[PDB]
Write a protein that binds this ligand. Sequence first.
Ligand SMILES: *[C@@H]1O[C@H](CO)[C@@H](O[C@@H]2O[C@H](CO)[C@@H](O[C@@H]3O[C@H](CO)[C@@H](O)[C@H](O[C@H]4O[C@H](CO)[C@@H](O)[C@H](O)[C@@H]4O[C@H]4O[C@H](CO)[C@@H](O)[C@H](O)[C@@H]4O[C@H]4O[C@H](CO)[C@@H](O)[C@H](O)[C@@H]4O)[C@@H]3O)[C@H](O)[C@H]2NC(C)=O)[C@H](O)[C@H]1NC(C)=O
Ligand SMILES: *[C@@H]1O[C@H](CO)[C@@H](O)[C@H](O)[C@H]1NC(C)=O
Length: 686
Amino acid sequence: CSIRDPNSGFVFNLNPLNSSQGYNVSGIGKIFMFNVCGTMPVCGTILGKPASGCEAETQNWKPARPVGIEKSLQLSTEGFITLTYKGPLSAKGTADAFIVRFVCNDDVYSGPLKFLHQDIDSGQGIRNTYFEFETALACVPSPVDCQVTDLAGNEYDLTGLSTVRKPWTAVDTSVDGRKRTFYLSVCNPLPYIPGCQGSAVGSCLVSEGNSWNLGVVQMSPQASLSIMYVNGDKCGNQRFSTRITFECAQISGSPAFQLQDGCEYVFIWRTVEACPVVRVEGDNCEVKDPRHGNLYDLKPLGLNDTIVSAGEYTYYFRVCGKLSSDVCPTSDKSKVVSSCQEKREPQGFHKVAGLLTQKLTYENGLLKMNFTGGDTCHKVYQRSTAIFFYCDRGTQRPVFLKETSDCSYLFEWRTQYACPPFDLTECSFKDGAGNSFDLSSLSRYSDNWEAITGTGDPEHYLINVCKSLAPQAGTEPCPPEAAACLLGSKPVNLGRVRDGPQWRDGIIVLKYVDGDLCPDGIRKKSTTIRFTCSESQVNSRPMFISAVEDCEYTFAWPTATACPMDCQVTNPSTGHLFDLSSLSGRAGFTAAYGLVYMSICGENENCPPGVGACFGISVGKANKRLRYVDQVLQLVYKDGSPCPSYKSVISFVCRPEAGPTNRPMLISLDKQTCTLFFSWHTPLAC
Ligand SMILES: *[C@@H]1O[C@H](CO)[C@@H](O[C@@H]2O[C@H](CO)[C@@H](O[C@@H]3O[C@H](CO)[C@@H](O)[C@H](O[C@H]4O[C@H](CO)[C@@H](O)[C@H](O)[C@@H]4O[C@H]4O[C@H](CO)[C@@H](O)[C@H](O)[C@@H]4O[C@H]4O[C@H](CO)[C@@H](O)[C@H](O)[C@@H]4O)[C@@H]3O)[C@H](O)[C@H]2NC(C)=O)[C@H](O)[C@H]1NC(C)=O
Ligand SMILES: *[C@@H]1O[C@H](CO)[C@@H](O)[C@H](O)[C@H]1NC(C)=O
């Protein structure tokens, strides 16, 4: 059922509206039903044909005025889209008609079908009936409002995704061969891409110098969140479509190509923009958290003037208070200075950077302060000072970020004062052998770990290491005491922090306890994290393993962190262990000069005992601290004879074949530091 707008040049398709339940509405004491670009087998059979529309009176097996033998679709005088189902020639040479108009609504897809009126010419036996059908398919390809509300009343905004300077893209290749780059836009047309322009192209595939428009910017986002772009260029008998499913997540994600269902390309987009927008203003330097319920109080940060240095300038500000420092002098009028830029001489001056304010704003889990009303910059702008507060264990000094185009001076401050109540545990332990383990690097204060489960899993798992969870984005927050959490019906506490990690039956176990009540109503849920040493897993995530009787939850985590902290050293990136013990020995070797005697990993029989190298005079004591640096193995022999302290740096370099003269060579003598630099090309370094 497809037509062209002469004003627009767009190809409209109502194809997607073929449905099976069809569409059914009341009026004039009877119910009118039909389907679109499809049949309505209920009340069918005009001749032997299945009928597109019907009529009946009810509340009914019996149909009436079956219609759909002559189907017609066209633009009227307005340039508005009309579909006519004419039925059979009853009498007097005229057929019963259904006339249905398609009216643009960006916000809905198969939007309310309302009966309008019917014209009754009894004289000519034509009972002609008139309908309106709201759809986004009627809308000409144009940019869309990118703000959404769900039925629960949570507001979102995906404008973040559309405002980017770069075009979002998902690359995807097959087992061998196929290589393609998906361009996605949100609510706005794609940026200029060679081969993809059309009218309002939302998703585009480029492969082998062929571009495909896989959906036009048509319908607004729907509520988790979804967008569909439809009416892309021909795919056999159909036209291409793209579905993007948004999911609320800690990261600023990219859209990831998931699968292809006929002519529809489906993507999953895990991003922070998809998270319910909730924002709150406070005064008296305090603000209440809408999710947890706790009160942030930043008054403690204002008990002294805060000084931050930048390049040549130096910034003074007092949190929620008047500056005490003898700079930017201004008491005149009703202006209380809270922020000052001082450019130190030369060509230095003092500029007021912000006035007193005790307003603390909370915007989607960030705390902000803006000191306004400063000295004029760029004729029209008043200098302002913004501080962004993030949760952290200790309240460290703020750091200068940048000056905006409107002379807003931006500061980040990670401080515990921005952190809800939170439990903490010692995260280093030792095994039976005395090897050191420290998982403290996996403790996250601003975010949490998202567990890896199955790809369709309706539930997500949040975990932190050796502490209770950081605050989470959304309006369904976990109980504050939880260190692990389940996110179905309600947020489920899976366990609180009690003890640190322990070597239990030859594996690293972290146990959280006293979560929500188990279904039997006598026990409380507990979580076990089983850590397994894996050098390659450097950014790894915990994999959810099992949930026994909705009571015992178990995760596994292969990670490089869980690994223990003899002339051998490990490549920190690959894990290949280089052993230089096979070269050691009191016997040792000589390097060209006069000569130089030296032994590695051990002492030499020509020098004083305990000295690694000498000539004749000690040039360094033997030692065992081997470093891997820049694909080279390195020893430093220090504390030698007096420098007219002599020292020897020995560097081992990869050589796939053992050369005809495979002995170390003195490559430098630094006279300013009395340092002897040796290089040795040996197959042992590969
Ligand atoms: C801490 O608090 C202070 C106080 O709240 C905040 O500082 C303020 O920042 C405001 C920006 O939101 C700024 O308002 C601006 O007033 C200027 C005066 O010239 C006005 O030009 C700005 O107007 C822009 O937008 C309006 C409405 O759309 C337009 O009518 C106007 O022509 C300007 O349009 C352009 O810039 C917009 C963004 O600024 C663009 O969206 C828009 O596309 C358009 O771009 C064109 O012109 C731009 C140059 O102006 C150019 O970059 C672009 O290429 C195009 O050529 C706006 O009303 C306040 O002036 C400022 N406070 C003071 C004292 O001046 C500060 O943000 C706070 N810090 C934090 C953390 O928020
Ligand atoms: C309409 O959809 C029905 C059922 O959903 C399917 O059997 C049929 O092939 C579709 N027909 C057209 C005209 O697209």
